[PDB]
Amino acid sequence: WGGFSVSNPTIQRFFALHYLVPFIIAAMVIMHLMALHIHGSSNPLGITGNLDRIP
Amino acid sequence: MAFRKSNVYLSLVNSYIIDSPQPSSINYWWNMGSLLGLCLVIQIVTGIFMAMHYSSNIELAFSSVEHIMRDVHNGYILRYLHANGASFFFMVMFMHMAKGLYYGSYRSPRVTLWNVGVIIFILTIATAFLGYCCVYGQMSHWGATVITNLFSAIPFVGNDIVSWLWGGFSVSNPTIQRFFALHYLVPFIIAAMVIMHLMALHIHGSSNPLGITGNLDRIPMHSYFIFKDLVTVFLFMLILALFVFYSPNTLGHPDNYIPGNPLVTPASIVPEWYLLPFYAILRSIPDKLLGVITMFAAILVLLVLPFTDRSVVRGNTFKVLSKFFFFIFVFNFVLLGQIGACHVEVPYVLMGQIATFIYFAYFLIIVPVISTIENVLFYIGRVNK
Amino acid sequence: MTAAEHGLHAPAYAWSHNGPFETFDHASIRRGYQVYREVCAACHSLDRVAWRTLVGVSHTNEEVRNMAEEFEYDDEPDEQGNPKKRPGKLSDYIPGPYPNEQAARAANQGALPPDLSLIVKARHGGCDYIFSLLTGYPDEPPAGVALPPGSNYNPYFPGGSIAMARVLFDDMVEYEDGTPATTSQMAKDVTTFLNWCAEPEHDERKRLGLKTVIILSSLYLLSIWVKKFKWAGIKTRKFVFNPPKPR
Amino acid sequence: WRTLVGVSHTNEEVRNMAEEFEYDDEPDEQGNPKKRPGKLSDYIPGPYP
Amino acid sequence: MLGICTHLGCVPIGEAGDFGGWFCPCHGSHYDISGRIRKGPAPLNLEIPAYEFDGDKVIVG
Amino acid sequence: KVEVNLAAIPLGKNVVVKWQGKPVFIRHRTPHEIQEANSVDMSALKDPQTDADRVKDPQWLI
Amino acid sequence: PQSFTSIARIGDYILKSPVLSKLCVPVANQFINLAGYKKLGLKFDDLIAEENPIMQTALRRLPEDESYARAYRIIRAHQTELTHHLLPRNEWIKAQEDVPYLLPYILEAEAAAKEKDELDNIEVSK
Amino acid sequence: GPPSGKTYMGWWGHMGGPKQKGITSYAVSPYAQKPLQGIFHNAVFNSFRRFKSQFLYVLIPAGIYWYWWKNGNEYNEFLYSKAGREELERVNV
Amino acid sequence: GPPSGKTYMGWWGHMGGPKQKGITSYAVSPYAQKPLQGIFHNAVFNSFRRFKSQFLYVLIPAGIYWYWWKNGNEYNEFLYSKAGREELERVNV
Amino acid sequence: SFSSLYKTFFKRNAVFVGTIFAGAFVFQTVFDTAITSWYENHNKGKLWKDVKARIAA
Numbered sequence A: 001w002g003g004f005s006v007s008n009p010t011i012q013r014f015f016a017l018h019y020l021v022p023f024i025i026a027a028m029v030i031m032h033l034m035a036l037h038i039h040g041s042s043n044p045l046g047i048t049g050n051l052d053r054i055p
Numbered sequence B: 001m002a003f004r005k006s007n008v009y010l011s012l013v014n015s016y017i018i019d020s021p022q023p024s025s026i027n028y029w030w031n032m033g034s035l036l037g038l039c040l041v042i043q044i045v046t047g048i049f050m051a052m053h054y055s056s057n058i059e060l061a062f063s064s065v066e067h068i069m070r071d072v073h074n075g076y077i078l079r080y081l082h083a084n085g086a087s088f089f090f091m092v093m094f095m096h097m098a099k100g101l102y103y104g105s106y107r108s109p110r111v112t113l114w115n116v117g118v119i120i121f122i123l124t125i126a127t128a129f130l131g132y133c134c135v136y137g138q139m140s141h142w143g144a145t146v147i148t149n150l151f152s153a154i155p156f157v158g159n160d161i162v163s164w165l166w167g168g169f170s171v172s173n174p175t176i177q178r179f180f181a182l183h184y185l186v187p188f189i190i191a192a193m194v195i196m197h198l199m200a201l202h203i204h205g206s207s208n209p210l211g212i213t214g215n216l217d218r219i220p221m222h223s224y225f226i227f228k229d230l231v232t233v234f235l236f237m238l239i240l241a242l243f244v245f246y247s248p249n250t251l252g253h254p255d256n257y258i259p260g261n262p263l264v265t266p267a268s269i270v271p272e273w274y275l276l277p278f279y280a281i282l283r284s285i286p287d288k289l290l291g292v293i294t295m296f297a298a299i300l301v302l303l304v305l306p307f308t309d310r311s312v313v314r315g316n317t318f319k320v321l322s323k324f325f326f327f328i329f330v331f332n333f334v335l336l337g338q339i340g341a342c343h344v345e346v347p348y349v350l351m352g353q354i355a356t357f358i359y360f361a362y363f364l365i366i367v368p369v370i371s372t373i374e375n376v377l378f379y380i381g382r383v384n385k
Numbered sequence C: 001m002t003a004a005e006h007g008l009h010a011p012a013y014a015w016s017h018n019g020p021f022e023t024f025d026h027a028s029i030r031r032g033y034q035v036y037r038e039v040c041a042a043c044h045s046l047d048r049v050a051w052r053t054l055v056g057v058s059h060t061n062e063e064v065r066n067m068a069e070e071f072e073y074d075d076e077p078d079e080q081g082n083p084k085k086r087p088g089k090l091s092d093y094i095p096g097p098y099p100n101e102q103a104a105r106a107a108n109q110g111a112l113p114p115d116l117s118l119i120v121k122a123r124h125g126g127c128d129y130i131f132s133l134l135t136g137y138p139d140e141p142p143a144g145v146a147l148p149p150g151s152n153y154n155p156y157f158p159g160g161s162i163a164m165a166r167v168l169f170d171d172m173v174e175y176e177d178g179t180p181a182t183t184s185q186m187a188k189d190v191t192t193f194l195n196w197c198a199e200p201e202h203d204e205r206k207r208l209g210l211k212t213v214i215i216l217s218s219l220y221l222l223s224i225w226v227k228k229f230k231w232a233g234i235k236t237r238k239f240v241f242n243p244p245k246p247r
Numbered sequence D: 001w002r003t004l005v006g007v008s009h010t011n012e013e014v015r016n017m018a019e020e021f022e023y024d025d026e027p028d029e030q031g032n033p034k035k036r037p038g039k040l041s042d043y044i045p046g047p048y049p
Numbered sequence E: 001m002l003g004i005c006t007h008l009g010c011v012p013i014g015e016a017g018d019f020g021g022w023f024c025p026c027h028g029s030h031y032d033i034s035g036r037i038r039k040g041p042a043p044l045n046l047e048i049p050a051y052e053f054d055g056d057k058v059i060v061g
Numbered sequence F: 001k002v003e004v005n006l007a008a009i010p011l012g013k014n015v016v017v018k019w020q021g022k023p024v025f026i027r028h029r030t031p032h033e034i035q036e037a038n039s040v041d042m043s044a045l046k047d048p049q050t051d052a053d054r055v056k057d058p059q060w061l062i
Numbered sequence G: 001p002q003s004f005t006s007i008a009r010i011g012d013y014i015l016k017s018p019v020l021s022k023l024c025v026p027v028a029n030q031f032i033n034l035a036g037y038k039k040l041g042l043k044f045d046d047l048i049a050e051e052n053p054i055m056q057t058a059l060r061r062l063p064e065d066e067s068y069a070r071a072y073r074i075i076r077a078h079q080t081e082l083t084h085h086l087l088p089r090n091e092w093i094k095a096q097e098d099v100p101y102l103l104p105y106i107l108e109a110e111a112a113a114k115e116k117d118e119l120d121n122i123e124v125s126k
Numbered sequence H, I: 001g002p003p004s005g006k007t008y009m010g011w012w013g014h015m016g017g018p019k020q021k022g023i024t025s026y027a028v029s030p031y032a033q034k035p036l037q038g039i040f041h042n043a044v045f046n047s048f049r050r051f052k053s054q055f056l057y058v059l060i061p062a063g064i065y066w067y068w069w070k071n072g073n074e075y076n077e078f079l080y081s082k083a084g085r086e087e088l089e090r091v092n093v
Numbered sequence J: 001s002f003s004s005l006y007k008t009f010f011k012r013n014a015v016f017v018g019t020i021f022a023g024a025f026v027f028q029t030v031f032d033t034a035i036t037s038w039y040e041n042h043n044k045g046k047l048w049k050d051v052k053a054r055i056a057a
């Protein structure tokens, strides 16, 4: 809280954090895409897709 | 294989700071890059914790900084760390760029790495300017007035760009809230362009003080340069702690403790010390349009270097004339800053015009002419013809 | 520019808080507040200093309670919405002599007396400039200068002419501790007090810098030994060349 | 007041409406409080202080 | 007219010195009612703002 | 902490003030209503709470 | 970036003029002595930047025994610089040993590259 | 992943230098050595050698730009003094 | 750079599937074809085929939870009216 | 013995790390107390506590 209840210290620090977390999200999306690029995506048939691929 | 090489995330750590093959001959001048990484982390963390107590309204900006010093616990430590840390940021960066100028690190195989560094230099200058304006003292308000008024010299569209930048008719409340939002964002662009800086270095690796190939003798990064970087890391915080706890206002200006007033000119107006050399170049041209263009040229001429060096040897280690004229440029840079903090007087006007000429003549005249002469001296000094 | 419009440079005095191991003289801080209240407070403000910050530095908790209760502060309106007033408390700020800036310029021949909460940090010279300005009024202006009416002469002020007149005269304040109050003694005490107003963290900052430098200097020495130990094999390494036979 | 012009009233009509109220002005040269009639840049005043 | 010295910016003191003009105490130059600087390194004359008339009155803008 | 005195409140009216971000009540007490609070139900309806700790100033209940 | 063909053209003209060979060479010998690469166990031909396609063919065509020796001198200099010392005075490269061993392999590779460029821009006199 | 272009550095085992033959190397464990060997000797004699070889390339440019600065400071001070009023009008005007 | 661990996808030319033999494929250029061909026929007959085979897996769960919601909503309206005030006492307390 | 010293504190990393943490806890409290004591003694007669008791005489 920064005090005894929800007050001026709380609102001012919540805006500083609302600015920061989106840039952390952008960093975890890259880690998300890096782990996908290992084996590639899946398909609705649930079987291997190595026999037919398109760019 | 080892888990540090097979994992998707650990393999990026292993390939960059653990198993990276480094030349065995690199000296302590190759330690400034790791220091710049610690400076960027220090500025981001102290800025975020200070931003929880800051207000960007033009009627509350100055008082919110005074609130941080007095009321916030350990708040003066954060503020003096952030203000002095930015001064040490430019100290290391100036030495980092002069190392590569001395050792020919801009040459052919690594032109892309050099070009990305110039972009980081431009962004860092903008970030420091925007944060200085957020204090809203007497030197930050009047410094912002002169800097943003130079865009009005652009033909046709010049006057409209200033109004769009100000958000009004002068430096007012819309400008100050504009600059704090940009001061939060630009450091994250720098962090993303630093990763592109390391990607372009990994293709060919680092250079060495001798200027020749380093593929014959390499040692891993971990436990050899991890502990050599730790030596300058501890020395870096020792000098910073001296300036933070025993002399926190030696690198500043006393006029920035007077709240911003648009009705009283603060006598001489100067920027921070690390922008002073470029401030003197702008004032040396008796023309607003031409003088403004020359100021960004001084950063863009660094891209001409890989093509005006006509030498077949990389670096200045074994070059007699190139070593002498290198320090002429270095001390010419220091004299330019002194003129930037001086008044417009009889001797100082011509001193800054000649020193401006030497700055540009070094890249375009001195380096091409000197490098061709030394090539012949190396040849005729050993061939029996 | 000329040295007249630059202003004479203040000399260097041996302040008791000068030095890496030195703190403020808290007896001069206590004496300096009395000079401010009886001489300075008629025309200057200290609006960045709260009453509570004086407790434990130069006054007791009960003393500051009686000091603040002599001023009237605005209160919340009553049940019918009419305005009210109340005596001060420890959480308030030291009030100024004027309601607005137009009132201040009207009482000072159109000149504005600046606030004195950061004046030590806002001038080139610090404590040496405030002391020299308060004790540097000559009885006569140098032969040749032409002062505008309503302005005084002081060599330490940039330009020469200053809108503030001499205000410190011998034996104008009666200190409680029996110290002879002279022009130099009062100018020295009020400057120490104003320095504490600008930097109230001075005492605790210097104590933290001693711990930081001692710890950081040990680490720098320890890391040199560790680096040389890990590099011992590479530093002492030998190479021999024996040319191979042609094949 | 300026937001009613061109929506429900004329410029010359809104000016008359605003001039029937009183707003705090800048203090005079002696520092006393002053009053002035309203302008288009003012906001619609309420009944209670 | 604008109350700024035409050289580097200053403040005009009200009706003091010269031909009943005003005073630029930044360096020691004065003014006149015509707004014509009589001494100093001023390159040009004082600038006037744009304005209109309420018949006989004066506005700023 | 708040510092409000009790020498400016009459007898027989509620006063509600805000402290620490939450409101509180205060009002002068009456002769027999507090004695009724002594005679009020002990523990047969909701809460086994005595009037010993609820009020420490028999003329103000906050 | 200045080609060795151009360097040799200027140098050979100087070395055949009796007046020009009298003042330039004495100051060129002092320039080489002050450069100080011989005190690390190096010849000048070991300092040429090798990350261009022209110098990659020259090092490929260098005879095998000369290539083994060059690798030792380069490794020796890196170890000497690592200690911030110099080589003992008896291990310094002498003037009669500082010969341009790689120069003929560079001038020949450069001549072949120049002829290729002139043949991609050929114009038959029709 | 696709292949990349041609660079001038490799990795361990395929670094990309010339073939090495005939060079032998010897080393001793750091646990069996004295890390601080010769620090006092190097701090004086090695330090003097390093300084004596480079101090002429730094001091001469520094002294040229310091003599220039001091000569320009004294001239400005003389110009704005009572004895320099005859020169200030003939230069700055 | 060093090589990484073994994965289950490769790249063009070494994708890592089984060896293929005896399969021929034919295709025609889109510039000589008719896009939108058969959309009207597919918009009614193909859509009915797809809807019929899946609508029972979606609608039966949807109808079960919707009946539960309406029944529990109607009971709440009964307890908070005059008709069901007696039951509200027992069920609540 | 030097063999027993290695076997107790330097053979297992868990004991080595735990010893560093327990030595940092003791150093933390002792270092602070010894610093204020020297700092206060170097400025005797200038502290509020000193002047408060003097005027209490």
Ligand code: HEC
Residues within 6 Å of the ligand: C039, C040, C041, C042, C043, C044, C108, C111, C112, C113, C114, C119, C123, C130, C134, C157, C161, C162, C163, C164, C165, C167, C190
């Ligand atoms: C009692 C001790 C006292 C101190 C200490 C003090 N004042 Fe001032 N003071 C002024 C005015 C007016 C100025 C502005 C001078 C100017 O701008 O030319 C000023 C300026 C100052 C300055 C700024 C100096 C500078 O360089 O700008 C300081 C510091 C200061 N006063 C401190 C009216 C007063 C008056 C009313 C007569 C009194 C009393 C007075 N001042 C008493 C004091």
Ligand code: HEM
Residues within 6 Å of the ligand: B029, B030, B031, B032, B033, B034, B036, B037, B040, B093, B096, B097, B100, B103, B105, B106, B113, B114, B117, B118, B120, B121, B194, B197, B201, B205, B206, B207, B208
């Ligand atoms: C935040 C800013 C920067 C960071 C974090 C950074 C980081 C690094 C690091 C870690 C290295 C390798 C280690 C080293 O050589 O010391 C490096 C090398 C290099 N940097 Fe930077 N750098 C920055 C800015 C710049 C700038 C402004 C320039 C030039 C204008 C630049 C040009 C170079 C060059 C040329 C190299 C290679 C030099 C060599 O290896 O010989 N960098 N950088």
Ligand code: HEM
Residues within 6 Å of the ligand: B040, B043, B044, B046, B047, B048, B050, B051, B054, B065, B079, B082, B083, B086, B089, B127, B128, B131, B132, B134, B135, B183, B184, B187
């Ligand atoms: C490379 C990164 C940064 C640099 C170089 C930088 C630079 C500066 C500078 C020079 C100042 C002027 C301070 C003074 O003169 O006292 C300043 C102020 C400030 N900066 Fe930064 N900054 C950086 C990052 C950030 C970030 C990321 C934030 C917030 C998330 C931030 C928040 C602030 C704030 C709130 C101030 C207010 C003035 C003060 O506290 O001193 N900074 N900055």
Ligand SMILES: COc1c(O)c(C)c(C/C=C(/C)CC/C=C(\C)CC/C=C(\C)CC/C=C(\C)CC/C=C(\C)CCC=C(C)C)c(O)c1OC
Residues within 6 Å of the ligand: A020, B016, B017, B033, B034, B037, B038, B040, B041, B044, B045, B048, B191, B192, B194, B195, B198, B226, B229
């Ligand atoms: C020695 O080897 C190295 C090396 O190790 C490193 C790191 C670098 C540096 C390289 C980089 C790419 C720099 C890395 C850093 C960045 C790109 C930017 C750093 C980013 C940040 C510091 C952002 C982190 C911010 C936060 C965690 C916000 C803090 C706020 C908090 C925790 C709020 C409190 C929480 C709550 C819930 C109230 C080198 O250059 C290098 O030499 C090769």
Ligand code: FES
Residues within 6 Å of the ligand: E005, E006, E007, E008, E009, E010, E024, E025, E026, E027, E028, E029, E040, E041
């Ligand atoms: S600024 Fe007024 S005369 Fe120059």
